[PDB]
């Protein structure tokens, strides 16, 4: 077994998908989770305008709408959350929301919380880089979505998928803090295929990420499909893989071995 | 196997321990983790004055001091963080700090962030209960500790142990959000026993938790040690155990089975 094969098996990625089958698999999973938990009635998700939250949101909304219909229980609701830091793509978020047409939309401006946090750090003499403040924002979004879910008998949806999970390209306990992952197993192009079949405007799924990573989503996706990619791209992916292992495990106990 | 036996096996608890051996196991684990990671030089931990953070802190400090001595690398530092909400257990925290004598101590007041988060929620019409605000504070504390770690090449210590893990008595991605768990495997009295051997003032290891849970630590600890306890305490523990499973796993994918 190569490392590539091992990654593929861990992340559950298929070389190809049937998009409609994957939509159905997802929606049925989200419905089963809701039904299993007596007190859970809502899903909560930050809608940013990016591909991942657009897709997860549409699927979650579909799950809610079907369950609501099956049960005749109107308490079943999808809660879209806008989470701008101050004056935010505002256009992209608005296209996502028209595509999803959520039962409810709330706007939580995270800027007072983030600013309060940074102020308290800088006062204690802790310098905060732009990267660091980015991670604070992602975590504050987590706090926001959990506060909403805590008050509205909800679960928080995450947008993690295989193309981000392989590179560890999320904030630990930030956008990586969620209850349920509807997109886990899909690569980036597979996510686009689902959006296309759901009827999304091509703007929602047609990069700063790739430059930051040093590798394209095309290479990442090809890798996860078992294809051969360049040596550089391969080494780059493996580096991110080994680096991000702590993000793919629970907090390290004296019994854990993955890190050694 | 009973459920009790299965809980014990998962949480790694011994029916009895040698405290000094357990101190050494922990410190050696903490040192190994630091040595493994080239860029990591600091441990970061919120010092509240409670038993758990006092013990984890002392052990993390010891790991830093020994490693610093072995390597002669002065970049190795333990960073104690005071995290009051406004104007605070102030006496207890001070005794913990004197007992630990940390390389550095920072104070981050979380009130501006927390208040900014709550005000933003209330402005979107979301009511926040005291319980909810409690979870917001725990999560803001997580944010603070990670921000410090992110600037100081550090890893955040968590204070989770078997007597909290069994009852799910932490906030998910709050005080549960951490990199490394030095106390994982110990029950509550076993933690006290380590503190005693380390020389701690008896005030540091001598309530609201037990009333909130409906079961005592004595019962909890006895359970984890394979002892028989009353039926009511037993059913109470199992209730918390089943409820808290989502806290003990990674976010739910379509492949996970534990929740079904
Ligand atoms: Cl599972």
Of the candidates B107, B106, B212, the one whose C-alpha atom is nearest the C-alpha of residue B169 is B212
Residue for token pair 């600013």: A115
Catalytic residue among A18, A22, A28, A52: A52
The whole-angstrom separation of Cα A35 and Cα A189 is: 31
Catalytic residue among B22, B160, B164, B175: B164
Of the candidates B180, B177, B187, the one whose C-alpha atom is nearest the C-alpha of residue B218 is B187
For A221, the token pair is 């996706």
Question: Residues of A numbered 155-174 whose beta carbons fall under 8 angstroms of chain B's beta carbons: which are they?
Answer: 158, 160, 172-173
Looking at the structure of chain A, the number of domains it has is: 1
Residues facing A44 on adjacent strands: A79, A156
Q: What does each C-alpha distance from A233 to A8, A9, A169, A186, B45 come to in angstroms?
A: 16, 20, 16, 20, 37
A164 assigned to active site: yes
A5 assigned to active site: no
Contacts of A251 in chain B (CB under 8 A): 158, 160, 176-181, 184
Closest-CA residue of chain B to A111: B116
Interface contact A126, partner B, CB < 8 A? yes
3-state secondary structure of A71: helix
Distance from CA of A221 to the nearest CA of B (A): 19
CA of residue B126 to ligand 1 center, whole Å: 33
Range of the domain at A136: 1-260
Q: What is the CB neighbour count within 10 angstroms for residue B151?
A: 17
CA of residue B112 to ligand 1 center, whole Å: 39
Catalytic residue among A164, A175, A219, A221: A164
CA of residue A249 to ligand 1 center, whole Å: 13
CATH at A229: 3.40.50.620
Residues 6+ apart with CB under 8 A from B179: A246, A251, A252, B149, B155, B156, B157, B158
Q: What is the resolution of this structure in A?
A: 2.1
What's the N-to-C CA distance of chain A in angstroms? 20
Residues 6+ apart with CB under 8 A from A232: none
| Pairing, β A42-46 against β A154-156 | parallel
The whole-angstrom separation of Cα A241 and Cα B28 is: 27
Three-state secondary structure along B4-62? HHHHHHHHCCCCCCCHHHHHHHHHHHHHHHHHHCCCCCEEEEECCCCHHHHHHHHHHHH
Interface contact B25, partner A, CB < 8 A? yes
B73: left (phi over 0), alpha (psi -120 to 50) or beta: beta
């Amino acid at each position: 077994m190569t490392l590539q094969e091992e990654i593929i098996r861990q992340l559950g990625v298929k070389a190809s998908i049937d998009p409609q089958e994957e939509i159905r698999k997802t929606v049925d999973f989200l419905k089963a989770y809701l039904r299993k938990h007596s007190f859970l009635k809502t899903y909560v998700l930050g809608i940013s305008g990016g591909q991942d939250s657009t897709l997860a949101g549409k699927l979650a909304q579909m799950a809610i709408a079907e369950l609501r219909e099956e049960t005749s229980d109107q308490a079943y609701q999808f809660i879209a959350v806008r989470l701008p830091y101050g004056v935010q793509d505002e256009a992209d978020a608005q296209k996502a929301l028209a595509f999803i047409a959520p039962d409810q939309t709330l706007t939580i401006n995270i800027k007072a919380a983030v600013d309060g946090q940074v102020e308290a750090l800088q006062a204690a003499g802790v310098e905060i880089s732009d990267f660091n403040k980015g991670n604070i924002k992602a975590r504050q979004r987590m706090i926001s979505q959990y506060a909403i879910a805590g008050q509205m008998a909800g679960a928080v949806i995450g947008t993690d998928h295989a193309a981000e999970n392989i590179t560890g390209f999320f904030t630990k306990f930030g956008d990586g803090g969620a209850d349920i992952l509807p997109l886990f197993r899909l690569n980036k192009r597979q996510g686009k295929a689902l959006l296309k079949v759901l009827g999304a405007d091509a703007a929602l799924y047609e990069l700063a990420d790739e430059v930051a990573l040093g590798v394209t989503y095309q290479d990442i996706d090809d890798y996860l499909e078992g294809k051969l990619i360049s040596k550089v791209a391969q080494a780059t992916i493996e580096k991110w893989w080994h680096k991000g292992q702590h993000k793919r495990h629970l907090p390290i106990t004296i019994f854990a071995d993955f890190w050694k």
